[PDB]
Enzyme design. Sequence first.
Site, PDB file in Angstrom:
ATOM      1  N   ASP A 240      -7.111   8.294   2.635  1.00  0.00           N
ATOM      2  CA  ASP A 240      -6.563   8.542   1.290  1.00  0.00           C
ATOM      3  C   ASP A 240      -5.422   9.577   1.260  1.00  0.00           C
ATOM      4  O   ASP A 240      -5.658  10.789   1.400  1.00  0.00           O
ATOM      5  CB  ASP A 240      -7.690   8.972   0.339  1.00  0.00           C
ATOM      6  CG  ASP A 240      -7.241   9.088  -1.124  1.00  0.00           C
ATOM      7  OD1 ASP A 240      -6.243   8.450  -1.530  1.00  0.00           O
ATOM      8  OD2 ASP A 240      -7.910   9.822  -1.896  1.00  0.00           O
TER       9      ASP A 240
ATOM     10  N   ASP B  82       0.231   6.614  -2.315  1.00  0.00           N
ATOM     11  CA  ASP B  82      -1.233   6.770  -2.311  1.00  0.00           C
ATOM     12  C   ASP B  82      -1.985   5.567  -1.754  1.00  0.00           C
ATOM     13  O   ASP B  82      -2.206   4.568  -2.452  1.00  0.00           O
ATOM     14  CB  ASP B  82      -1.721   7.086  -3.729  1.00  0.00           C
ATOM     15  CG  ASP B  82      -3.223   7.226  -3.823  1.00  0.00           C
ATOM     16  OD1 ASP B  82      -3.907   7.313  -2.782  1.00  0.00           O
ATOM     17  OD2 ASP B  82      -3.731   7.245  -4.960  1.00  0.00           O
TER      18      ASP B  82
HETATM   19  C1  AEH Z   1     -11.314   1.934  -2.746  1.00  0.00           C
HETATM   20  C2  AEH Z   1     -11.873   2.552  -4.034  1.00  0.00           C
HETATM   21  C3  AEH Z   1     -11.942   4.057  -3.985  1.00  0.00           C
HETATM   22  C4  AEH Z   1     -10.779   4.828  -3.887  1.00  0.00           C
HETATM   23  C5  AEH Z   1     -10.870   6.226  -3.852  1.00  0.00           C
HETATM   24  C6  AEH Z   1      -9.620   7.056  -3.741  1.00  0.00           C
HETATM   25  C7  AEH Z   1      -9.339   7.821  -5.039  1.00  0.00           C
HETATM   26  N1  AEH Z   1      -8.701   9.153  -4.727  1.00  0.00           N
HETATM   27  C8  AEH Z   1     -12.121   6.858  -3.914  1.00  0.00           C
HETATM   28  C9  AEH Z   1     -13.288   6.100  -4.014  1.00  0.00           C
HETATM   29  C10 AEH Z   1     -13.183   4.713  -4.049  1.00  0.00           C
HETATM   30  O1  AEH Z   1     -14.341   3.983  -4.148  1.00  0.00           O
END
Ligand code: AEH
EC number: 3.4.23.46
Length: 357
Positions: A34, A218
């Site tokens: 991320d 992102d």
């Molecule tokens: C792929 C979905 C997902 C994305 C994120 C990033 C958000 N900063 C966090 C939890 C999550 O389940």
Amino acid sequence: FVEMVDNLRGKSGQGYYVEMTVGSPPQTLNILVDTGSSNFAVGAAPHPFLHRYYQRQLSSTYRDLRKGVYVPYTQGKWEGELGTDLVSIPHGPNVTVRANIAAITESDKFFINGSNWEGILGLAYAEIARPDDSLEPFFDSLVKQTHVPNLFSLQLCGSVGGSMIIGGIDHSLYTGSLWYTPIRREWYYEVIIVRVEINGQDLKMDCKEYNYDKSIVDSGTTNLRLPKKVFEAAVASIKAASSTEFPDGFWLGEQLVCWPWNIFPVISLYLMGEVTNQSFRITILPQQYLRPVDCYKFAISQSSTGTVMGAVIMEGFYVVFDRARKRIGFAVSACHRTAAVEGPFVTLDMEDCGYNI
Ligand SMILES: CCc1cc(CCN)ccc1O
């Protein structure tokens, strides 16, 4: 960097993950990559949705920091205990570092049922780390403690697979040249968009609003997300470009549509370049913003938090997160009408496109 090629896995819409090891002896966990957050946080309790989790009791190298962390989202949240332990990336550089870890003990709507990952690797900067900017993010610890250069790159190939090259660039992952946009401020990976074209036509908006709030790169977000006024203009224009055939809900992401590419326009983002009055452009094919779920979801959506160049955008490009030189580079991916990165272009008053506090 052959050891690091094809080191990312995933499922459509559920993000990309890398294999990591924490603690001694090594605990193997799959970790979501991320670039939109700054915490390293792993499940540390037997949540039913999880294949495996961080078991601190099994680790001699674990050290408790005696402080809690609460990260709420619109959707839900996660909550954990801060500590530090030894971290490695099997398909990464041959090093081991002491990083901060947030042991997740309570979560709501964070983990996905059916996903194969158990944590999140926040790759952004200290400024947006929780609880505050003194919690040194993973990559900072990596650079500080090893000889690993201060940059990484992502090739997301849209189930899914990809590459995270830690500490460098692998030229076999892109064609043409890399083009660089400045990181406006070291918190998220914030960049400045200076022009938007649909098929070949300018939205003719004050460029300040393409960045209203901010614009960021992102990998944790799926869609291309646009500020409200921009999305509105953008959709109205894609509509006009393809009015050959759809419900109002399809555009708002309230329902899918089924069946044919050429009625759909390419999308161009011009990004502030490295030189005064110089820009470059990235061009995305409708194969990117119309995601298969032959029923497709419209993978563009409005935002209250600024532009988000999510996985939809990144999947066509090799993206270099060049932290050492405060820049982000784009090139056409070796795994992506064809997706394009072109330049230079002349764009005046680019600094005015940034929105100020
Ligand atoms: C792929 C979905 C997902 C994305 C994120 C990033 C958000 N900063 C966090 C939890 C999550 O389940």
